[PDB]
Design a protein around this motif. Structure first.
Motif, mmCIF file in Angstrom:
data_model
loop_
_atom_site.group_PDB
_atom_site.id
_atom_site.type_symbol
_atom_site.label_atom_id
_atom_site.label_comp_id
_atom_site.label_asym_id
_atom_site.label_seq_id
_atom_site.Cartn_x
_atom_site.Cartn_y
_atom_site.Cartn_z
ATOM 1 N N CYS A 1 -1.478 26.920 -34.250
ATOM 2 C CA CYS A 1 -1.942 28.283 -34.398
ATOM 3 C C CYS A 1 -1.591 28.982 -33.106
ATOM 4 N N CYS A 2 -1.259 30.260 -33.203
ATOM 5 C CA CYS A 2 -0.941 31.045 -32.025
ATOM 6 C C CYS A 2 -1.750 32.333 -32.081
ATOM 7 N N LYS A 3 -2.155 32.823 -30.917
ATOM 8 C CA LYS A 3 -2.980 34.023 -30.837
ATOM 9 C C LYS A 3 -2.336 35.276 -31.427
ATOM 10 N N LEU A 4 -3.152 36.096 -32.081
ATOM 11 C CA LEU A 4 -2.693 37.377 -32.604
ATOM 12 C C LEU A 4 -2.975 38.344 -31.477
ATOM 13 N N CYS A 5 -2.264 39.462 -31.446
ATOM 14 C CA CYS A 5 -2.478 40.457 -30.410
ATOM 15 C C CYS A 5 -3.535 41.469 -30.830
ATOM 16 N N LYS A 6 -4.461 41.758 -29.922
ATOM 17 C CA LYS A 6 -5.540 42.690 -30.212
ATOM 18 C C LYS A 6 -5.063 44.124 -30.344
ATOM 19 N N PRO A 7 -5.816 44.949 -31.090
ATOM 20 C CA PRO A 7 -5.439 46.355 -31.233
ATOM 21 C C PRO A 7 -5.213 46.947 -29.847
ATOM 22 N N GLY A 8 -4.193 47.792 -29.721
ATOM 23 C CA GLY A 8 -3.830 48.387 -28.451
ATOM 24 C C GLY A 8 -2.717 47.597 -27.786
ATOM 25 N N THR A 9 -2.374 46.461 -28.391
ATOM 26 C CA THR A 9 -1.314 45.588 -27.888
ATOM 27 C C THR A 9 -0.387 45.160 -29.024
ATOM 28 N N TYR A 10 0.760 44.592 -28.666
ATOM 29 C CA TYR A 10 1.725 44.116 -29.653
ATOM 30 C C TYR A 10 2.333 42.826 -29.115
ATOM 31 N N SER A 11 3.041 42.094 -29.966
ATOM 32 C CA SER A 11 3.662 40.842 -29.540
ATOM 33 C C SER A 11 4.910 41.081 -28.688
ATOM 34 N N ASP A 12 4.793 40.807 -27.397
ATOM 35 C CA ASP A 12 5.913 40.955 -26.483
ATOM 36 C C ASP A 12 6.786 39.696 -26.545
ATOM 37 N N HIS A 13 6.132 38.536 -26.587
ATOM 38 C CA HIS A 13 6.809 37.242 -26.681
ATOM 39 C C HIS A 13 6.030 36.309 -27.603
ATOM 40 N N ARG A 14 6.701 35.788 -28.622
ATOM 41 C CA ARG A 14 6.077 34.845 -29.544
ATOM 42 C C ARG A 14 5.682 33.607 -28.766
ATOM 43 N N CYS A 15 4.754 32.833 -29.313
ATOM 44 C CA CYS A 15 4.333 31.603 -28.661
ATOM 45 C C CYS A 15 5.454 30.588 -28.861
ATOM 46 N N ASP A 16 5.471 29.555 -28.030
ATOM 47 C CA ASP A 16 6.465 28.495 -28.143
ATOM 48 C C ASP A 16 5.773 27.185 -27.793
ATOM 49 N N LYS A 17 6.536 26.107 -27.653
ATOM 50 C CA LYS A 17 5.940 24.814 -27.335
ATOM 51 C C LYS A 17 5.099 24.889 -26.062
ATOM 52 N N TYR A 18 5.629 25.580 -25.060
ATOM 53 C CA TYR A 18 4.972 25.711 -23.767
ATOM 54 C C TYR A 18 3.779 26.661 -23.731
ATOM 55 N N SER A 19 3.972 27.881 -24.227
ATOM 56 C CA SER A 19 2.925 28.897 -24.144
ATOM 57 C C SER A 19 2.473 29.552 -25.446
ATOM 58 N N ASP A 20 1.383 30.303 -25.335
ATOM 59 C CA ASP A 20 0.831 31.055 -26.452
ATOM 60 C C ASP A 20 1.434 32.457 -26.409
ATOM 61 N N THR A 21 1.114 33.268 -27.411
ATOM 62 C CA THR A 21 1.620 34.631 -27.497
ATOM 63 C C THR A 21 1.402 35.437 -26.223
ATOM 64 N N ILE A 22 2.385 36.269 -25.887
ATOM 65 C CA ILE A 22 2.262 37.196 -24.769
ATOM 66 C C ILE A 22 2.230 38.589 -25.389
ATOM 67 N N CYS A 23 1.106 39.280 -25.228
ATOM 68 C CA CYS A 23 0.923 40.609 -25.804
ATOM 69 C C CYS A 23 1.045 41.730 -24.775
ATOM 70 N N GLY A 24 1.820 42.755 -25.105
ATOM 71 C CA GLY A 24 2.001 43.880 -24.208
ATOM 72 C C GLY A 24 1.207 45.102 -24.633
ATOM 73 N N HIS A 25 0.887 45.966 -23.675
ATOM 74 C CA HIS A 25 0.149 47.193 -23.973
ATOM 75 C C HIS A 25 1.028 48.140 -24.774
#
Length: 127
Positions: free
Chosen positions: A15-39
């Motif tokens: 499972c990978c984190k969804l981005c909260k309202p006010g943010t969007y998916s800047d970088h999808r999650c991968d083996k190493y990290s979880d989702t990176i969400c941008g303003h």
């Protein structure tokens, strides 16, 4: 995965984190990290926990014959309503009124009794 918190990523088998309202998916999650969400950039928004690659453009200014009931914010699209003298003839799915019509005016000897389900005036005779 948890509703409105994470989603299932078939490629990473987790499972990978969804981005909260006010943010969007800047970088999808991968083996190493979880989702990176941008303003969300200015004049854009996201109203739900998302996987969106970009934020949605806010609709433009309302105008004179509309009232801006909801401003354009990172979590809210701009919403335009009819003024208090009018009712909406055609609504958008988000509540934005496209088309306003003036409320019926009660004649002399009549007054407002209330409004109908459409938002128009119901007139009663004054005793």
């Amino acid at each position: 995965c948890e509703q409105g918190v994470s989603y299932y990523n078939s490629q990473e088998l987790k499972c990978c984190k969804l981005c909260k309202p006010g943010t969007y998916s800047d970088h999808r999650c991968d083996k190493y990290s979880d989702t990176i969400c941008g303003h969300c950039p200015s004049d854009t928004f996201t109203s739900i926990y998302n996987r969106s690659p970009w934020c949605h453009s806010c609709r433009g200014p309302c105008g004179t014959n509309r009232v801006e009931v909801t401003p354009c914010t990172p979590t809210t699209n701009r919403i335009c309503h009819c003024d208090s003298n009018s009712y909406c003839l055609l609504k958008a799915s988000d509540g934005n009124c496209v088309t306003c019509a003036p409320k019926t005016k009660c004649g002399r000897g009549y007054g407002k009794k209330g409004e109908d389900e459409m938002g128009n005036t119901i007139c009663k005779k004054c005793r």
